[PDB]
Design a protein around this ligand. Structure first.
Ligand SMILES: [Zn+2]
Lengths: 81, 278, 74, 81, 73, 95, 50, 201, 86, 77
RNA sequence: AUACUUACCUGGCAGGGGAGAUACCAUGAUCACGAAGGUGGUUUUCCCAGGGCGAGGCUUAUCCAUUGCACUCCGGAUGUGCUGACCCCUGCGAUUUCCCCAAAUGUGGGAAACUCGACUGCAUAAUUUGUGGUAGUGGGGGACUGCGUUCGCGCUUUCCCCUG
């Protein structure tokens, strides 16, 4: 497994922002990530394309449909890096 | 195999992981068996066995009333086919408190069936020789030279021992097998006269077992000497004891003192046989 | 009919005139000659139909499999 | 495999067109098996933008539409392995 | 080729964002390592406010962007 | 695979008989070839080599496309490598 | 693809989702992690020493 | 990082959520395609073939000069052998005498073995009319082989059955019948024939 | 892979498929070209319909970013590693 | 768990009339009876027709193989 | 921590430059002096891949020297980043046994044993990244429509230009 995916798994349990291909943005607690970058998240503030926001309880996102994630800065101090 | 779809046999650690990942469900389980529940407890499996129970559907458990052991009602429930209450069976050799905890949770008004040949040490003639390790090979040879009734079994602790001891005997002009079915046939047939083996099937009664290396616990020792047979000729188990075996002396001493078919002050009076180990 | 599946369906169609429709709206008509395990298609006497009606006559054509939406007889 | 060929083009100066209209002119330092491509002495010209000169550029290979090769590049020689 | 972790959402009512700006909602009866889904008692959620019921249905994993649990897992 | 053993010049059979024969024969006989490409331009040229993906090395290509009234455009490119994914359709020169 | 735990300095010769989760919810592992970030707080003492 | 003391786990805190900004590109299904993908029918300018190049250009490099060279050596070789072949006639060789059918062929001899030791070893099977050991007409070094003509065919047959592999002066010898003058179509090893397989590959 | 390693821990400007630029300290990559960028800033060019007027560049700070390889186009070196000598 | 491959098989057996939503194409759908299919989710459809949102008019196709990449959803009647 | 034992979870396979050429050596080639070649060396030419050595040069600042008359660059020192000829090496970073060279416990040469750095190939171009629904069908400046209008614009039809 690649270093960057490890880093994704290390942010399991914390707050991540995640932009999807569609342009929505999901901010919340990352519960569990898989190696494909499928992500389950809780307590999200979705931000739709237009700017309007919403609250969602439990969400799961296909890895193939993610642009990028914003992880907690502390992760930069994980051992490899 | 899981993908294919009546009975699952499992170990606790493996089963909980599978349930936890939903590789398998207990939706139509109507039969629960805990085999050697005391050994499960000894291994530290109580919490895992608890957690496994938590995945069984609660609504198929029998009611906790006198009806759970009413034969007319419970028989009618058995015959009720698909919709009967679950039934649970626990097998165990002992009932320490943890096992009784399992029973209180898993079972409802269970019947107990207690049965009771099972204790080879009482009925197998046992002899010991205290020596240093370097003395073992010559004492074995001296014993073999006295002659024996083939086949016999010689036990050793490590598989390399097995192979090298076996070579030496074939060197001394002995017919020796190492340790599948092929080996036992020859022995049974008379071809091979000596089986060398480690604590690792099914084999005829033997006149003699030699513990070239003493077992590391008394349960393995008991199983070994049990190879002289369940009954009939007592047979003989000869054990070479060294100072490296001191942690089994106390239990070995007990095994022999409880054997009316056995005569050993060398062990019985030994400083290391006086108190339980650890 | 049995369960008639894609590979043997096309193997049926090979030799016969067929029409293939691409994801991008054009369609190609002609004698299906060959196909592979990725379902690339070779056509012969191929003609191009843009937006439903005939555009022109082409020739021997390879169609890269990713481009194809559906394929159908005559 | 025909990337095998592209991997031989080190030190050759090429022009690459990207699936997004960007044109890259540069000298190939290396190509890898996924067609990812590294260049040096680069003039990148994003679609309808003024050129920009760069010491170095790497391109994820899926983005390449084509390589335009030197007029003189000895193809037959290079295609024998 | 590891399967996706959708045990959590099994037999739950979901709302799914799909490829073409299409949204659909229903009860998750199963899945594949491609993340192909089986939804049950599924409702179309057409762009017009209108909803339509087509029950049992297969969704290709490829075309699923995000799913939200309505019954909170 | 269908051929899980690593003796699979079954590709070489598939190139000779299968649909990529269009290329194998074009390369063989030095025939022109017209490719409709996913930048929506059309490349007419010769095929010096190709692979499974339809990666092609081309020579003497004329790239032709169409801008805005609609104006035709063209450019000569003497040696290129085209990435296979960007092929829609290849057409061998009829005559 | 064969998995290396940077915290434990050990390998999982055959990685799976199940295996890596088992490892990561392991006694040895969790201790090594705790240690790693305690050791990082020691890095902060190396600030005041300046 | 997951189940740590809340002491340390407060380090893994998010930064503030990022300002909204609208998307850059439209969604792919809702983009307006001003010149959508289009076909190639308009484009059969091609070129009329009476100005088309002929096919064959391509082929070997150093790979062609190499292949040609092996090919020629082989052919050159076959012609050499053909030519020798028609010089070869053991019925007209002054060395080959007497009854071929009473003649034994012995090879793999030690170069040190004398004609005496050999006559001794093979006399056991019967009286020998003649021994001819073979020497290089160039060096005069022994070739390791001889013809032994017996008085009687029977005795030759006997040596043939019993002497093969016989050890003489440390070396197992090979024993056969003379074939040069008996076997239809025989050629020796130097002419591309021969028996034995020490150097098949 | 040294072609990528050698720029590791530099400040690198990455062009994404939608035309965003990520500039960030280049901490890690993989066979996909998934990236890890530190102190990553996103920039983007906004066209003026209002007048034939200068472009807006719009910065937005992201911090520690994991970029999915699929969305990467190109990357060039922006600057040297933030430096530990004075 | 009902699993998506089986549910397609169910559709096959029933000879249920299936409507397919398409991938990145929102104006057209396709409907027909699933005669057969494969590992890639390519479908053989027996009486297929192509259905457009604006027209409410249906183009008849006959027997078709529809490549998997296109499918976004499978529906009944 | 180490070694083993049991249980549970897991489990692809294959490899180590390539292709030519070698007149010479070994293989002392079974037919009257001889195969050719093949195989193993040796030498060498291509395809070249990773290391060694760093001559020279590029860039910028501290200190030191310099008040100098040129028109052929061109004082010294020290340090961050670079580029890099000639000439070498052949594959790699760790372990175990045997044989020999021997300045003989050193320092070498020849074999294997199968061992990790997720090295590479592969039913890997078929839904989650490495063979496309991210195509690349403009922005602006003047002439030149109507409709709504809050007169700022939104939609819509053109012409001529600038420009990516
Ligand atoms: Zn660990």
């Amino acid at each position: 497994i690649g270093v960057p995916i490890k880093v994704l798994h290390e942010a399991e349990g914390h707050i991540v922002t995640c932009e999807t291909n569609t342009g929505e943005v999901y901010r919340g607690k990352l519960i569990e990530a898989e190696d494909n970058m499928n992500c389950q998240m809780s307590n999200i503030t979705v931000t739709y394309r237009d700017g309007r926001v919403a609250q969602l309880e439990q969400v799961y996102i296909r890895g193939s449909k993610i642009r990028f994630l914003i992880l907690p800065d502390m992760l930069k101090n994980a051992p490899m890096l | 195999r899981l993908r294919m779809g009546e009975i699952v046999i499992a170990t606790p650690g493996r089963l909980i992981d599978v349930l936890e990942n939903r590789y398998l469900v207990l939706s139509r389980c109507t039969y629960v068996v805990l085999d050697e529940a005391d050994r499960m407890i000894d291994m530290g499996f109580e919490p895992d066995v608890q957690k496994i129970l938590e995945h069984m559907p609660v609504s198929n458990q029998k009611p906790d009333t006198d009806e759970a052991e009413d034969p007319e009602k419970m028989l009618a429930n058995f015959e009720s086919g698909k919709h009967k209450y679950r039934q649970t069976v626990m097998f165990t050799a002992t009932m320490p408190p943890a096992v009784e905890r399992l029973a209180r949770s898993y079972l409802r008004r269970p019947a107990v069936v207690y049965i009771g040949a099972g204790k080879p040490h009482e009925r197998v003639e046992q002899k010991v020789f205290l020596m240093s390790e370097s003395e073992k090979r010559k004492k074995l040879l001296a014993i073999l030279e006295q002659g024996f009734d083939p086949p016999i079994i010689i036990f050793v602790n490590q598989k390399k021992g097995c192979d090298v001891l076996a070579k030496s005997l074939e060197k001394m002009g002995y017919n020796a097998c190492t340790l599948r079915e092929f080996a036992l046939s020859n022995l049974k047939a008379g071809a091979k006269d000596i089986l060398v083996a480690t604590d690792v099937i099914d084999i005829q009664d033997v006149s003699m077992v030699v513990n070239y290396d003493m077992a590391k616990n008394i349960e393995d020792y008991i199983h070994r000497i049990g190879r002289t047979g369940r009954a009939g000729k007592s047979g003989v188990a000869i054990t070479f004891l060294t100072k490296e075996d001191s942690a089994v002396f106390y239990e070995l001493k007990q095994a022999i003192l409880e054997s009316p078919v056995s005569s050993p002050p060398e062990l019985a009076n030994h400083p290391d046989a006086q108190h339980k180990p650890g | 009919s049995l369960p008639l599946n894609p590979k043997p369906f096309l193997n049926g169609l090979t030799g016969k005139p067929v029409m293939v429709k691409l994801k991008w709206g054009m369609e190609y008509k002609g004698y299906l000659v060959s196909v592979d395990g990725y379902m690339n298609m070779q056509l012969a006497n191929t003609e191009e139909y843009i937006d439903g009606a005939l555009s022109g006559h082409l020739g021997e054509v390879l169609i890269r499999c990713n481009n194809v939406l559906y394929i159908r007889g005559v | 495999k025909l990337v095998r060929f592209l991997m031989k083009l080190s030190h050759e100066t090429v022009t690459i067109e990207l699936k997004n209209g960007t044109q890259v002119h540069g000298t190939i330092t290396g190509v890898d098996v996924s067609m990812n491509t590294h260049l040096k002495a680069v003039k990148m010209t994003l679609k309808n933008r003024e050129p920009v000169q760069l010491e170095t550029l790497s391109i994820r290979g899926n983005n390449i539409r084509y390589f335009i090769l030197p007029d003189s590049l000895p193809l037959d020689t290079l295609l024998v392995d | 080729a590891h399967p996706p972790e959708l045990k959590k959402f099994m037999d739950k009512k979901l709302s799914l964002k799909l490829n073409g700006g299409r949204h659909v909602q229903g009860i998750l009866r199963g899945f594949d390592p491609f993340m192909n889904l089986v939804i049950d008692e599924c409702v179309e959620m057409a762009t017009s406010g209108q909803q339509n019921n087509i029950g049992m249905v297969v969704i290709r994993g490829n075309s699923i962007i995000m799913l939200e649990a309505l019954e909170r897992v | 695979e269908m051929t899980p053993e690593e003796l699979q010049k079954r590709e070489e059979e598939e190139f000779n008989t299968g649909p990529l024969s269009v290329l194998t024969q074009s390369v063989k006989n030095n025939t022109q070839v017209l490719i409709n490409c996913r930048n929506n331009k059309k490349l007419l040229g010769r095929v010096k080599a190709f692979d499974r993906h339809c990666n092609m090395v081309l020579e003497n290509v004329k790239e032709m496309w169409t801008e805005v009234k609609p104006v035709n455009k063209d450019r000569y490119i003497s040696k290129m490598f085209l990435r296979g994914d960007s092929v829609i359709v290849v057409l061998r020169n009829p005559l | 693809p064969k998995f290396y735990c940077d915290y434990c300095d050990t390998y999982l010769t055959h990685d799976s989702p199940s295996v890596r989760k088992t490892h990561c919810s392991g006694r040895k592992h969790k201790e090594n992690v705790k240690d790693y970030y305690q050791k990082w707080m020691e890095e902060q003492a190396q600030s005041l020493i300046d | 990082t997951q189940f740590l003391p809340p002491n340390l786990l407060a380090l893994f805190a998010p930064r503030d959520p990022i300002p909204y900004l609208p998307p850059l590109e439209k969604l792919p299904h809702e983009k307006h395609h001003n010149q959508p993908y289009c076909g190639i029918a308009p484009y059969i300018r091609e070129f009329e073939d009476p100005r088309d190049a002929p096919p064959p250009t391509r082929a070997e490099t150093r790979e062609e000069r190499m292949e040609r060279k092996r090919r020629e050596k082989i052919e050159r070789r076959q012609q050499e052998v053909e030519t020798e072949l028609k010089m070869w006639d053991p019925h007209n060789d002054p060395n080959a005498q007497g009854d071929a059918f009473k003649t034994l062929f012995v090879a793999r001899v030690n170069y040190d073995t004398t004609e005496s030791k050999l006559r001794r070893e093979f006399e056991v099977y019967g009286p020998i009319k003649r021994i001819h050991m073979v020497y290089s007409k160039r060096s005069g070094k022994p070739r390791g082989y001889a013809f032994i003509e017996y008085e009687h065919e029977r005795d030759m047959h006997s040596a043939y059955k019993h002497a093969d592999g016989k050890k003489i002066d440390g070396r197992r010898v090979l024993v056969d019948v003379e074939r040069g003058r008996t076997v239809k179509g025989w050629r020796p090893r130097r002419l591309g024939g021969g028996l034995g397989g020490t150097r098949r590959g | 892979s040294s072609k990528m390693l050698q720029h590791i821990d530099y400040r690198m400007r990455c062009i994404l498929q939608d035309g965003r630029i990520f500039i960030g300290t280049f901490k890690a990559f993989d066979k996909h070209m998934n990236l890890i960028l530190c102190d990553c800033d996103e920039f983007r060019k906004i066209k003026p319909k209002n007048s034939k007027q200068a472009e807006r560049e719009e910065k937005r700070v992201l911090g520690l970013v994991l970029l999915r390889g699929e969305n990467l186009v190109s990357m060039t070196v922006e600057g040297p590693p933030p430096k530990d000598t004075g | 768990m009902v699993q998506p491959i089986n549910l397609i098989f169910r559709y096959l057996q029933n000879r249920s009339r299936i409507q397919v939503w398409l991938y990145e194409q929102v104006n057209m759908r396709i409907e027909g009876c699933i005669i057969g299919f494969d590992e890639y989710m390519n479908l053989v459809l027996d009486d297929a027709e192509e259905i457009h949102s604006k027209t409410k008019s249906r183009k008849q196709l006959g027997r078709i193989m529809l490549k998997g990449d296109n499918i976004t959803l499978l529906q009944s009647v």
